[PDB]
Amino acid sequence: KTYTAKPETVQRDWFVVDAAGQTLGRLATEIARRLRGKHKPEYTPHVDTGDYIVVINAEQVRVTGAKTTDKMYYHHSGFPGGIKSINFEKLIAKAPERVIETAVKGMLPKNPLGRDMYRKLKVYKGASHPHTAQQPQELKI
Amino acid sequence: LWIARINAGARQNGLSYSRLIAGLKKAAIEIDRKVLADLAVNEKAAFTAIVEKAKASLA
Amino acid sequence: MKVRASVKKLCRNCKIIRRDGIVRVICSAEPRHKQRQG
Amino acid sequence: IGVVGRKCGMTRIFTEEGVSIPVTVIEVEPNRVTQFKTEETDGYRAVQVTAGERRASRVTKAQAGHFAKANVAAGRGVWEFRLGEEQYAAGDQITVDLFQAGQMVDVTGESKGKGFAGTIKRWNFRGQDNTHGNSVSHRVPGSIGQCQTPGRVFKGKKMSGHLGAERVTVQSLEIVRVDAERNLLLVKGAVPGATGGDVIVRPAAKA
Amino acid sequence: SRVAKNPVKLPAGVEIKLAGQQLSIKGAKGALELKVHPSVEVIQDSGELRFAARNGDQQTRAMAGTTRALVNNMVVGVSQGFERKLQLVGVGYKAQAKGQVLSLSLGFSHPVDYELPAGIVAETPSQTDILIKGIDKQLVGQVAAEIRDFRPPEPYKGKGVRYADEVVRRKEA
RNA sequence: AGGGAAACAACCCAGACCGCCAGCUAAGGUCCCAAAGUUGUGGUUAAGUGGUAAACGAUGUGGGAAGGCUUAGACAGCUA
RNA sequence: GAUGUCGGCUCAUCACAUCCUGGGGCUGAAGCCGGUCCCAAGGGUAUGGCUGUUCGCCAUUUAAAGUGGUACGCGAGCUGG
RNA sequence: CGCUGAAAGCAUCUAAGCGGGAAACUUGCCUCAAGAUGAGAUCUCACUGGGAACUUGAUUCCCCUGAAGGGCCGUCGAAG
Ligand SMILES: [Mg+2]
Ligand SMILES: [Mg+2]
Ligand SMILES: [Mg+2]
Ligand SMILES: [Mg+2]
Ligand SMILES: [Mg+2]
Ligand SMILES: [Mg+2]
Ligand SMILES: [Mg+2]
Ligand SMILES: [Mg+2]
Ligand SMILES: [Mg+2]
Ligand SMILES: [Mg+2]
Ligand SMILES: [Mg+2]
Ligand SMILES: [Mg+2]
Ligand SMILES: [Mg+2]
Ligand SMILES: [Mg+2]
Ligand SMILES: [Mg+2]
């Protein structure tokens, strides 16, 4: 019978990603791939086996074309006519961390495994992170 | 699942699944996906010894 | 301005300019020849 | 900053000219400072404020030790005010001395609670007829939504229930008189809440 | 022909502190002019100046003409004083400059007190004449347009602040 | 029945006797949801075209063969 | 082997092809006023006589008395004209 | 509504760049708001005893201890 990973016997590593001009979508797909764990031979769809990801610059991210002044982010509050929108340029100045999180959130399963994988993503808008004890290793150099 | 595991094991060695199967088919190694995903996880040395020969096949 | 679907010159002083992706028409002699969209 | 007092009923005073000034008398005990939340340890900047007269048997040991860092011997309740920039020591006394004539202020406080109010009283709805053939429905709400394709009732719909004692603030009430001897504030207008309640007086930012 | 090919032939007193990416012109009668040119450019150093692009695209061909003219404007700014002659037309209109304050009377209830920016200094030889002296054409024109926008001209009377352009609209009915 | 067109008895591929944790293909795909090319070479397109739409309008841009004048001085502008 | 049809009252929600308020271009716009056309849905947008009437005509205002969708909204909320 | 400015020696509000700009947009005024499972943050208070089996973040059980405080109950409220 084929081997299946066990959550009690899983190995997970810490990585740090520097987004200082990286394309939003081409960075988010690598982050989501490494969060789901498609880079390991022992990948299982039913249990999570992935590596923690740390983003240190959530405001230097780059979007190509005229999407800086476009690409509205819609969402509804629940009340009638509660539709609200904000563009990339205004959102990246207000909440830089939520710009890149929503891209990865829409690129994971919509099951409770997706929520667990999303909790391993930890973005920061500054230049340093509070995970020096974990000692993440640089990748994508 | 076996295809996904073999692709993950091969990308760590420096190939892709589409090129790996072609390299295997340039010769006739004839190892199934069930017994390539098992070697990808447990027998990593044997999987690497298969992948290097697939690279040597130049395909 | 004069919103249309076919902007065109009306006198020798009309110059057609594409401003911010919109085909504008500006006339230095007759302000009535100014046309916005087309 | 602001001042915490008690509503004590409304009154009226007459000026020399002849006009009547409706007044709400606000009793203000001298207020002690309990904390001074600096920015380095708390983020924002604010100051705690407390009124007196609470018996020792009703204060927990945690609160007794909290009121022991600053020698306050504090009483009922603790209120906090956000301030721009002004230094305050651990033990200080805030009185009515910071107010003057005019000086439009904002007055908050828990309003008088109606038990469980209908739609005519809560939302000022209009009632149906009373004689022209009407059935039992005379004051009940009418329709809620459209027939087939809202598919539901929209959230935020105005319905009956609990005209409550929730916090409400009357904006920009001018002070008529300040008493530094009896510790009173005379505010021109109404104040939310019943007499003998708790009221917060702050300078008006709307101006 | 293409303006980018013509040289600049800077006058006597000019200094070129060219750092490759950031050019700077210093001279008498105003100084401290500098511009960060687009990256895709070539700038030589000699008695004159010439500009040339690297990639023959539809963008750099226009960038070369734009930057040559910008450098020419910077050179002329520290050699000749830019001016904008604005004249007031209408009864009861006057301008009274008080140093860095230019107060105008345009028939409004309150007197507008337009504050000039740094560098530009305006002078009023008459009550119906403004002379906006400066070092940068862009800032001089912007200040002149902002002063003009308070009361633009009227075709039935000409009653409004207007500059030397004599193509003002005119109609009577 | 199955696979594809996001879901879509009638459209495309293909007709399930049963079992396999075996391999090759069709339509349709190979960045992540999602299995498989961030594969190789020569170009175009910047508008999110792709990812709805006609009359008609426009010195948008790439390519093709013919033309009219021109160092005897053209086309622009500057002076009569 | 049942989806209760027109008006009225109560309660509203949504589109802008906008009636008022807001910012502008042109005008055969002297001024006061106007006509036409872009941007704009934040808030407002009448009481009566007649008629079952929606609509419509009237008298009197108001800055205005908008056009539509929502089973020509709303009868397990009311009337049965 | 513009200023500099070429492509296209002029002109040109735009291709780069620099401005003004309305009840719309985002702050500013008021209320709820860490079930914000990302569950945040400051001050203060309370607990400092042993034994056995079995396996070892060591688990389970016996006795002694029950503090900070909370609840029960009662007198009530311009709270319900
Ligand atoms: Mg779902
Ligand atoms: Mg614009
Ligand atoms: Mg009450
Ligand atoms: Mg009755
Ligand atoms: Mg019904
Ligand atoms: Mg539904
Ligand atoms: Mg195959
Ligand atoms: Mg895949
Ligand atoms: Mg039935
Ligand atoms: Mg519109
Ligand atoms: Mg607003
Ligand atoms: Mg109906
Ligand atoms: Mg009934
Ligand atoms: Mg907490
Ligand atoms: Mg005790």
Residue with tokens 């031979």: A41
The pair of structure tokens assigned to C31 is 């302000």
Task: State how far the alpha carbon of E129 is from the alpha carbons of A72, A127, D44, E50, E124, in Å.
Answer: 50, 56, 55, 39, 6
Give Rg (Cα) of chain B: 10
Chain A partners within 8 Å of D154 (Cβ): 79-80
E60 φ/ψ angles, rounded to the nearest 5 degrees: -65, -30
CB of A107 nearer than 7 A to strand F = yes
Chain D: give the shortest CA distance to residue A82, in Å. Answer: 10
Residue D108 forms beta bridges with which residues? D200
Q: Within an 8 Å CB–CB cutoff, is residue B41 touching chain A? A: yes
How far is it, in rounded angstroms, from Cα D170 to Cα D200?
11
Method used to solve the structure: cryo-EM
CB A36 within 8 A of CB A121: no
How, if at all, do strands A52-55 and E112-115 pair?
Answer: unpaired
Chain B partners within 8 Å of A42 (Cβ): 5, 41
How far is it, in rounded angstroms, from Cα A78 to Cα C12?
58
D177 φ/ψ angles, rounded to the nearest 5 degrees: -150, 150
CA angle B3, B5, B9 (to 5 degrees): 115
Contacts for E15 with CB less than 8 Å, ≥ 6 apart: E24, E25, E26, E27
**Residue from D81, E16, B42, D66 nearest A5 by CA:** B42
Q: What do you get for the CA distance between the two ends of chain A, in Å?
A: 39
- The string of DSSP codes covering C1-38 is ----SS----STTEEEEEETTEEEEEESS-GGG-B---
Q: What is the resolution of this structure in A?
A: 3.0
CB E84 within 8 A of CB E163: yes
How far is it, in rounded angstroms, from Cα C23 to Cα E114?
36
Residue numbers 97-116 of D with CB closer than 7 A to any atom of strand H: 106, 108, 112-116
- Contacts for D202-206 with beta carbons within 8 Å, 24 or more apart? D202/D1, D202/D2, D202/D3, D202/D81, D202/D105, D202/D106, D202/D107, D202/D108, D203/D2, D203/D103, D203/D105, D203/D106, D204/D104, D204/D105, D204/D106, D204/D171, D204/D172, D204/D173, D205/D106, D206/D106, D206/D171, D206/D172
- Containing A32, the helix (H) or strand (E) segment is helix A24-36
Give Rg (Cα) of chain E: 20
Q: What torsion do the CA atoms of C9, C10, C11, C16 make, to the nearest 10 degrees?
A: -20
**Residue from D6, D76, D85 nearest D34 by CA:** D76
Q: Helix, strand, or coil here: A88?
A: helix
Chain A: give the shortest CA distance to residue D153, in Å. Answer: 10
How far is it, in rounded angstroms, from Cα D186 to Cα D102?
11
Q: Helix, strand, or coil here: D72?
A: coil
**What's the maximum distance between 2 C-alpha atoms anywhere in chain D?**
72
Q: Is A14 exposed, middle or buried (0-12, 13-18, 19+ CB in 10 A)?
A: middle
CB E138 within 8 A of CB E130: no
Q: Helix, strand, or coil here: A92?
A: helix
CB D22 within 8 A of CB D14: no
How far, in Å, is the centroid of ligand 7 from the Cα of B36?
Answer: 16
**Residue from E63, E92, E71, E67 nearest E10 by CA:** E71
Q: How far is the CA of A73 from the C1' of F5 (A)?
A: 29
CB D31 within 8 A of CB D72: no
CA angle D84, D86, D87 (to 5 degrees): 140
How far is it, in rounded angstroms, from Cα E82 to Cα E76?
8
CB B58 within 8 A of CB B26: yes
How far is it, in rounded angstroms, from Cα A54 to Cα E2?
52
How, if at all, do strands D199-203 and D102-108 pair?
Answer: antiparallel
Q: Helix, strand, or coil here: E86?
A: strand
Q: Is A16 exposed, middle or buried (0-12, 13-18, 19+ CB in 10 A)?
A: buried
CB of D139 nearer than 7 A to strand G = no
CB A47 within 8 A of CB A61: no
Chain A partners within 8 Å of B42 (Cβ): 3
Determine the distance from the C-alpha atom of residue D168 to the mean position of all C-alpha atoms in its chain, rounded to a whole number: 6
- The string of DSSP codes covering E119-155 is S-EEEEEETTEEEEEBS-HHHHHHHHHHHHTTS---T
Residue numbers 14-33 of C with CB closer than 7 A to any atom of strand H: 15, 17-21, 26
**Residue from E99, E88, E77, E73 nearest E147 by CA:** E88
Q: How far is the CA of C27 from the C1' of G42 (A)?
A: 37
CB of D145 nearer than 7 A to strand G = yes
Task: State how far the alpha carbon of D164 is from the alpha carbons of D111, D112, D192, D195, E53, in Å.
Answer: 7, 7, 12, 16, 73
The pair of structure tokens assigned to B45 is 């040395």
How far is it, in rounded angstroms, from Cα A109 to Cα A117?
9
Give the single-character DSSP code of B46: H
Whether A42 sits inside 8 A of B12 (CB atoms) is: no
Q: How far is the CA of D61 from the C1' of H65 (A)?
A: 22
Residues E11-29: b if buried by 16+ CB within 10 A, e if exposed: eeebeeeeeeeebbbebee
CB A117 within 8 A of CB A108: yes
Q: Return the residue of A nearest to B12 by Cα.
A: A39
To the nearest 5 percent, what fractions of chain A are helix, strand and coil? 30, 15, 55
How far is it, in rounded angstroms, from Cα A62 to Cα A92?
11
HSE-CB for E99 with a 13 A CA cutoff: 2
CA angle A43, A45, A51 (to 5 degrees): 50
- In chain G, which nucleotides are within 7 Å of a protein Cβ? 9-15, 24-31, 37-38, 42, 70-71, 73-75, 77-80
Chain A: give the shortest CA distance to residue B3, in Å. Answer: 10
**What residue spans of chain D are helical by DSSP H?**
39-42, 61-66, 119-122
Q: Within an 8 Å CB–CB cutoff, is residue A13 touching chain B? A: no
- Containing E35, the helix (H) or strand (E) segment is strand E33-36
CB D47 within 8 A of CB D37: yes
The interface residues of chain A toward chain B in range 41-70, judged by CB-CB distance below 8 A, are 41-45
CB E77 within 8 A of CB E141: no
Chain B partners within 8 Å of A39 (Cβ): 8, 11-12
HSE-CB for C19 with a 13 A CA cutoff: 9
- The string of DSSP codes covering B6-45 is HHHHHHTTT--HHHHHHHHHHTT----SHHHHHHHHT-HH
